[PDB]
Design a protein around this ligand. Structure first.
Ligand SMILES: O=C(CCC(=O)NCCc1ccc(Cl)c(Cl)c1)/N=C/CCNc1nc2cc(C(=O)O)ccc2c2cnccc12
Length: 330
């Protein structure tokens, strides 16, 4: 059997709270009425939801309405409770209302509107400073929700809204977020393939906040190297292969042995043997301007098989990669 694991920060925060903080199944919801919101236009279709720009008719404030696709009432109360618990935190999207369409009785969430920006020209005029500033802002959100006993489990660029005009960032879509409890075994069929931590890929269920830190490193690798996504896996098994060809296999089979993780028999004959690559082999003329020694050192310390040895969000925010960003904020 697999060796147990504990988060090495914020391990017990939820045990210390009243049970109603994390026992979301018994959370009572006060379902509002839509019609206070006229849908303006559709902003996106996800697997679990559709998102619309809408107008609150009472005061004309721009707003966003996420119409939840049929899931277990559990998953809805989870997202609501986590949103309610994180309300007011740095760079957490604000849940404004909880409504139900009066005829369909379908649940919907009403969020603050964010004037997010043309990521097309955003990715072109992206500076080394830009990437450091917004990475720091994400870490603010990550460190806060981890400190509140909450894993996001779906960190990825589509879930980061930037209002580049106002230098504002919001971490959104908390529908896969979970309360961390020491010793709990989680589903690994969460997040998007290209951002899954190896713990998800090898089926290690006793993971923790450090899962978000892996995804964040995937976002970081993808941007500084101008390669989206950075690990481009054909499927969930070929994803570990793509990681193995970069991080090497020696650390992989040590991670496996260290947690007595039983590996799938698909895996034996597809991983093979690979050396840990030096990051310089991903630098080239069209991305030098974003790569620095500090960037590479920070990236290396996020992309580790062992989740325990990844930096915490707080540790990350003290890395030399962010020294100038920290200065300007004072
Ligand atoms: O645009 C996007 C993707 C944006 C993007 O590529 N970023 C780049 C990542 C990045 C870039 C540079 C750097 Cl340097 C770094 Cl680090 C990261 N995704 C939005 C879809 C629908 N739009 C909305 N979706 C919501 C959902 C929820 C929810 O489900 O909770 C609540 C509220 C909203 C919402 C609120 N107001 C306006 C629009 C929306």
């Amino acid at each position: 059997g697999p060796v147990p694991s504990r988060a090495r920060v914020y391990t017990d925060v939820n045990t210390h709270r009243p049970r109603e903080y994390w026992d979301y199944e018994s959370h009572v919801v006060e379902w509002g009425n839509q019609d206070d919101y006229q849908l303006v236009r559709k902003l996106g279709r996800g697997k679990y939801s559709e998102v619309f720009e809408a107008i609150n008719i009472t005061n004309n404030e721009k707003v966003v309405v996420k119409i939840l696709k049929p899931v277990k009432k559990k998953k809805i109360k989870r997202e609501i409770k986590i949103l309610e618990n994180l309300r007011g935190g740095p760079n957490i999207i604000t849940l404004a209302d909880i409504v139900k369409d009066p005829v369909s009785r379908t649940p919907a969430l009403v969020f603050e509107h964010v004037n997010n920006t043309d990521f097309k020209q955003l990715y072109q005029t992206l500076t080394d400073y830009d990437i450091r500033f917004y990475m720091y802002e994400i870490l603010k959100a990550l460190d806060y929700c981890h400190s509140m006993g909450i894993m996001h489990r779906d960190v990825k660029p589509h879930n980061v809204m930037i209002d580049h005009e106002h230098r504002k960032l919001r971490l959104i879509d908390w529908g896969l977020a979970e309360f961390y409890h020491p010793g709990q075994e989680y589903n690994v069929r969460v997040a998007s393939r290209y951002f899954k931590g190896p713990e998800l890929l090898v089926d290690y269920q006793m993971y923790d906040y450090s899962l978000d830190m892996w995804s964040l490193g995937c976002m970081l690798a993808s941007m500084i190297f101008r390669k989206e996504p950075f690990f481009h896996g054909h499927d969930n098994y070929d994803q570990l292969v793509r990681i193995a060809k970069v991080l090497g296999t020696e650390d992989l089979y040590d991670y496996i042995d260290k947690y007595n993780i039983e590996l799938d028999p698909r895996f034996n004959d597809i991983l093979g043997r690979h050396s840990r690559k030096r990051w310089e082999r991903f630098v080239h003329s069209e991305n030098q301007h974003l790569v620095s020694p500090e960037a590479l050192d920070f990236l290396d310390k996020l992309l580790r098989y062992d989740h325990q040895s990844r930096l915490t969000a707080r540790e990350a925010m003290e890395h030399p990669y962010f020294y100038t960003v920290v200065k300007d904020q004072a």
